[PDB]
Amino acid sequence: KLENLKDKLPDIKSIHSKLLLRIGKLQGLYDSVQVINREVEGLSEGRTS
Amino acid sequence: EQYCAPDTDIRGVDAQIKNYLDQIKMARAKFGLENKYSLKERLSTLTKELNH
């Protein structure tokens, strides 16, 4: 059963490429929340234009 | 919720914040000016003329 190890390899390349996709999405949600917390800090200083 | 729902570009939803982040002071300077003095001095003289 270990002789081929051929058609069992690209179905782990598939589930590993979706996980690296889901990491980069939620790493982008934690970079737009840190934009909202830079505006609400600066706006509640008192200086708007 | 649109960052994690599938089949979406990331840069197309990052521009929905720049829309939202400027619609939040276009409603805070619309009630921070009409409540500043145009409704302050309508209650300044009218509470003196009630007392008299």
Asked whether B22 and B12 are in contact (CB, 8 A), the reply is: no
Are residues A25 and B3, on separate chains, in Cβ contact within 8 Å? yes
Approach to solving: cryo-EM
> Distance between CA B52 and CA B31 in Å, rounded?
31
Asked whether B3 and A26 are in contact (CB, 8 A), the reply is: yes
> Distance between CA A11 and CA B39 in Å, rounded?
68
Q: How far out from the chain centre does Cα B33 lie?
A: 11
| E-state strands within chain B | none
| Residues of chain B positioned with their CB less than 8 A from the CB of A48 | 25, 29
> Distance between CA B12 and CA B14 in Å, rounded?
6
Nearest-CA residue of chain A relative to B14?
A32
Would you put residue B23 in left (φ > 0), alpha (ψ -120 to 50) or beta? alpha
Resolution of this PDB entry, in A?
3.2
Are residues B14 and A32, on separate chains, in Cβ contact within 8 Å? yes
